Protein: Choline-phosphate cytidylyltransferase A
Organism: Rattus norvegicus
Amino acid sequence: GLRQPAPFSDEIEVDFSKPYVRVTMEEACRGTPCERPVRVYADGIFDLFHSGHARALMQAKNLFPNTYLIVGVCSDELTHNFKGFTVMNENERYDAVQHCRYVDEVVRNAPWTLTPEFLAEHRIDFVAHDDIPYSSAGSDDVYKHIKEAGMFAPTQRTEGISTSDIITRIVRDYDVYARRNLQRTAKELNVSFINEKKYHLQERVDKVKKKVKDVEEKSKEFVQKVEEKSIDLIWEEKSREFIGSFLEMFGP
Amino acid sequence: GLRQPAPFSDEIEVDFSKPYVRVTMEEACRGTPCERPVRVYADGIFDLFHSGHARALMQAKNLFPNTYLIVGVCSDELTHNFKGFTVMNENERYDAVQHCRYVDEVVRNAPWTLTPEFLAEHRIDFVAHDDIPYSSAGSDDVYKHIKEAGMFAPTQRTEGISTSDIITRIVRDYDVYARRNLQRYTAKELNVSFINEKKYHLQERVDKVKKKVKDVEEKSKEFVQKVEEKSIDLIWEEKSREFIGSFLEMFGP
Amino acid sequence: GLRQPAPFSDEIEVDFSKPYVRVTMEEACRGTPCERPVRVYADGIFDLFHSGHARALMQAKNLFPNTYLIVGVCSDELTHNFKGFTVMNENERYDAVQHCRYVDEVVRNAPWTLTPEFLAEHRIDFVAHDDIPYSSAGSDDVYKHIKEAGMFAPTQRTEGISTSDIITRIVRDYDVYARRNLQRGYTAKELNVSFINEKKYHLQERVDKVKKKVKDVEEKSKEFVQKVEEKSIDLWEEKSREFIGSFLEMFGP
Amino acid sequence: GLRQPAPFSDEIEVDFSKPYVRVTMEEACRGTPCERPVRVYADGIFDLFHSGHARALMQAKNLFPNTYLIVGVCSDELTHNFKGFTVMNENERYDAVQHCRYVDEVVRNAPWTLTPEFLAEHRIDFVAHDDIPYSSAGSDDVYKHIKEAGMFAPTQRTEGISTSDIITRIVRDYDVYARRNLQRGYTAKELNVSFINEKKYHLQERVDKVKKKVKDVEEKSKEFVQKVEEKSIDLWEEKSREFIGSFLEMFGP
Ligand SMILES: C[N+](C)(C)CCOP(=O)([O-])OP(=O)(O)OC[C@H]1O[C@@H](n2ccc(N)nc2=O)[C@H](O)[C@@H]1O
Ligand SMILES: C[N+](C)(C)CCOP(=O)([O-])OP(=O)(O)OC[C@H]1O[C@@H](n2ccc(N)nc2=O)[C@H](O)[C@@H]1O
Ligand SMILES: C[N+](C)(C)CCOP(=O)([O-])OP(=O)(O)OC[C@H]1O[C@@H](n2ccc(N)nc2=O)[C@H](O)[C@@H]1O
Ligand SMILES: C[N+](C)(C)CCOP(=O)([O-])OP(=O)(O)OC[C@H]1O[C@@H](n2ccc(N)nc2=O)[C@H](O)[C@@H]1O
């Protein structure tokens, strides 16, 4: 078992009388001497440290028979820049990752993109992460070059677990709980009633409009009729009436 | 035959050393002595004097074997009062009736309603006219009392003839003739047609406008409804689902 | 007097064993022994039989001390042909003449021009008509040959009356009455149109009012919605700080 | 280092041919020969497993030179019952504890109170927890009997962290956000209502204008009609005096 936490990058003596030399998959998988383990670097936010992270690092720890696991954790600043908010700030996460079972070494304030000098500084043989492309601003995959170096080691993501999930359970519950403790009833009932009332009113208004339209149409029709009559008028008809009337003047 | 016209009432000597005595149907129909004829009175407007009148007076002249026919003709004034217009005034009608074949005597300016003193003055035995009730103002029949006296003698009206008819033929013809000589034209007709067309067009336009207005109103109503709906919606249950995901966008992809 | 109408020619018997022998102006004016009256012929349409006609016939009857008056009445066909229309129809005018006072005998269906044989069968001694030469057919006078025989007796037209006047009065009155009435109806139509326009304006007003009401309702609804929103908003901080704590109570202290 | 997770209790073999014999603070702190580590028990929900937990476990692991750390994780049922809810579910927390650095073995479905037999089967030498007396059930401390046995090893709570805080941050942020969003929508909603009201009024005005126009058109039409009527009326007297005469021409001169 292990009594003490994982050394931060800084705590350890490192020797430059030893040149930078990576191993290859073959002689790494044959497994390295105990003095010279294979050195692997996994990186990420590790916000709300959870099982997915942990067995990702387990996968990574197990890649080779003899392995030394260094884990880069990104700063709050960088993470808010390129990604979004952390619920837990960088220190909590450093502690968090420090406390993991498969972790030999923790690297604070780790870079979004990995550089030749980073890889040389920390003597990294391989880089463990999931094989999805990581698109962080300006790059479609920030692991592209490490993949190309033959350096990249893919891992598998746990399903059902993720920080987004852990956040969404809580938020989900609190939303309905809060909204529920708002309406706490008469008013709510009234509102429902009001909507119904409003609807009824709207219907009435529509009906009224329709009626008005009908009236207008009728008026138009009447006008048309009048016009027609006028046209017709414009003696043949009224002669029959003219004569009899004229002769009324002469008696019964 | 007869050379001279019928005496007006005035021209004749009349004697009051002879009391007023009417006869009755029986001894009148046995026929009277030549010195004492039966005396009968027929009356009316006699406007546009015609055959109906004439054989009415013939009927009347023939009522008894010996008969003297006096015919009352009403004045213009009275006739316009109680009846209507005459086309011919009273003098023309006096002449007219004077010239009839069966007429012995003419009575000018005769009364609408006959009075005891009229009947006594002119010594009238009987009064000849058609058996229709004559309704002249205030009375349902102005012959009622003469009918009751046993004095009345009915007559028959000729059919097809009457002053109204004689007037209506003329008026009928002149109406259509005149109206006909008015429209007398093609150009005018064309113009009228054009005007009508224009009117129709205008009407159509108006209708279209109305329709448009209606449509607008409908649209407005719809908008109002939508607004109401929105308000109702506003009045968390719906937008929570959207609130949460959005909230979690903040934490990354 | 005379109780009976005038015979027609065909109603009458005539002795032809009596040769046709006319009589002179002289020995006629000496007067004609009772059984040989002078026989005079007068002719015409007698349309709208009137007093001019009648007095013409009176002159005719009085031309001699003893005179027999035969009067020809021309047919509808002859008359429509050579003259013009008639408001009276030939039978009506036959009757008309029949009821005249100075007329002994009526001759139906009379000739437009008079012939030796016509004058023979009716044994006509003289002819009575006005002395204005009569132009119809191609004849510039149809009586000229009767003149030349010295068989003509002129008469005098009466004044202010003739069949045309009687027409003209009625005609006029009906022309002015018709036309007047024609205008009045148009005025009534104009009055109706006023009514219609006013009704349309009121309907428009009503519509406007309705629209206004609708608008008001909408406004009210909006206000209500706003109020609701406000209420919702209110429903939160203090009771929030209450909420969260309450919610964490459930998982423990 | 450590490539492998922590066993559970049931994953593990145990020799019961070895009787249950505890060890003193003293001879434990002298250090325990490799094959007999001291065995320490620490317990808890470990909901939202965090650094306070982990350091608690580190203390637990370091209580002696040679120490075996067994850690009980209470169930969802026990926990919901005697404590409150958990956002983490018992399997999740089993795993959580499994991945801790100082933890040799994990015990699933742990007791709320510890029993002689529980302490027997797991061969538990000591117990590591904070020294704040734990009040749940009716017990005002559930560790008191473990205290009295002298079997208790206190530990220290870390600072500024605990499962409740992690809740509270998110809670707060979402309260202010959700309320803030709701409020913006009310702000947006009011503006929308204003747009709706502005739309309503303009439209109404337009409608009114249209109506007015229609009315005007109608009026114009009426006027036109009137004019036409007038014209018609104008279109008779002179030609009247022409007419009547013309009409009397037909009956003769
Ligand atoms: C910024 N980079 C790209 C340099 C480092 C990667 O950044 P990231 O966002 O992948 O960090 P993260 O904390 O989300 O993921 C950390 C590691 O845990 C793994 N992981 C995460 C969640 C999960 N349910 N299963 C996992 O296996 C990821 O594959 C990743 O390899
Ligand atoms: C005023 N009165 C009642 C006193 C007299 C009658 O007035 P009147 O209107 O009957 O006079 P009139 O000139 O219309 O009718 C005169 C006479 O002719 C008769 N007559 C009239 C028209 C006709 N087609 N046939 C007729 O027999 C009527 O019966 C009446 O007897
Ligand atoms: C056709 N004829 C010649 C055979 C017959 C004469 O035809 P007419 O046109 O003279 O007939 P008419 O009805 O006009 O006239 C009939 C008679 O009435 C007389 N008459 C008519 C109107 C009047 N105002 N005065 C008259 O004296 C005429 O002299 C004529 O003798
Ligand atoms: C129910 N029991 C008594 C059987 C087990 C204890 O239950 P609990 O409520 O202490 O469990 P928990 O998850 O709250 O605490 C787990 C462990 O982490 C430690 N812990 C937790 C939070 C913190 N800020 N500091 C700590 O030292 C506690 O001392 C405890 O020993």
Notes: Chain D touches chain C through 46 residues (CB under 8 Å). The pocket of CDC (ligand 4) is lined by residues D 42-47, 52-53, 56, 74, 112, 129-130, 134, 142, 155, 157-158, 161-162 (CB under 6 Å). Residues 54 and 100 of chain D are 7 Å apart (CA to CA). Strands of chain D lie at 38-44, 67-74, 105-110, 126-130, 152-155.
